[PDB]
């Protein structure tokens, strides 16, 4: 965007080579809002619960919650961060398959009422320390196998515990849409099975792994259509755990250069750069505008190796790099974008 | 490690599931001293400089500096930490190929007199902001380029400290490749006195240190030449021991025989219970943090979370939250 480029340049001008930091973040408030209203439009029946683990930055977590998003917390620290921002503990879901005893007890005292289980031991762990917490069964390491579902449901019933419903999380190898279709059908069967156990499961957590099925508008339409076709009980509500989807367009990294090496190899020179970070995606050189024939060279950018991209020859201390749409798991001053 | 086992089992018996921590560290002071004296006994002509980047934990960094070790710092934070512990800036070497301008200017004021280079640009940077700082050339295209950099060092009027490289017979080639560079630089009108062989140590060690010490003599470096190294994993490994607690268990029958998964806070031991020969063993998988991560797939007996713990021997190598100093 042009507004992001101009705001970055206005901030870069405040620095000389001697005083320039490793980099700075740009908080795209409109980028967060556009992602939320896009979700609410395409998936009306599924309320998004942001995975705080993806990006626990106070401003983003605050903004998302104010926009009506729920909260997906993996640890007690993530639980406490949400509660400190003034959000109600009912909107929080303690999504941790194996919880530390001290944290599980503290969560109960803090007012947390929703958690996830994928083992017979965790059912007993909850029954012993916080037996009032609602339990969600995780289906498909990480998850519960087909035959084990009955053994766990029996244990939840035998311990007299509350079942909120079913949960599933797909891997990083999402891409194929039909895995969500199968997992929802598998979840629908788990509901009717649990209903026979005398339980009333009202919550289906479809998990995360979004923005990995590209035509989102269409991918959201398929989930929405499948939800209707499976005919879930009238009382059932649907939540998701989108992390990468919400956090991506939230932040923009603007890094500085503090190293250069020109190396002619196999006939043509490649230029190595060292960007503001320790040596251990797509970016552009914002400081100089490309005049078409600006002599583009294959550039290797180091943190170990953050980007291999076609870039014009840059001068360390003068030239800067903008990495568009970061914050997604990538988590040093943060400047809010003007709007 | 009978003494370490008893010190842990004592601290374990103090916790119940309700208040058990994720894990605690045991700082083996004796383990550091034995590793340091092993270096000096087997490699006397090479002075060890600890890579603070490997483990910047104050207890390790302070003890090593008292034992005679130098300091290898990759950033200004590592430089300042060493100086805050009360160490002479001469013992510190700013080992960073590409330094930020602000950090380099500050390092010059802090008293840092030694740094490394591998590119022609970094030479001009040091000449522009910290010209008094001594320079080391990096070796192993980066071979014919050595002549290009040395010319830039000379033309800017900078002090050449010597040659530095980072990787059994690979060291023999690298030390010889360094010796040929020294004579090359001497013909330019420069006097390289420092040779940094790098790290990656711990290999039989005793035999490895013998080949290095022998190769040093055969190459016949000038009388003034001093030898230094950057061992990280070597010094840090035996310094700390991790004692994890268990807060997750899952039983799963696999094709006939059961495998049990565990979630805790390489080699590990169930110190909470004694394993008398046959006490029933199971293919156990131990996990850590991150909910989508895998530390061990080891042969272990059945364990109960909250009751049973884990001891990971020699874990101080690259980790960096509670430290218990091992007696005595």
Author numbering:
A (entry chain A): 5 to 144, 157 to 296, 309 to 331, 338 to 365, 379 to 386
B (entry chain B): 5 to 144, 160 to 186, 193 to 227, 230 to 292, 309 to 335, 338 to 365, 379 to 386
Quoted passage from the original study:
Ornithine decarboxylase catalyzes the first and rate-limiting step of polyamine biosynthetic pathway. L-ornithine is decarboxylated by ODC enzyme in the presence of cofactor pyridoxal-5′-phosphate (PLP) to produce putrescine. The ODC enzyme is an obligate homodimer with two symmetry-related active sites located at the dimer interface. The ODC enzyme from E. histolytica belongs to fold type III group IV decarboxylase of a B6-dependent family, having eukaryotic ornithine decarboxylase characteristics.
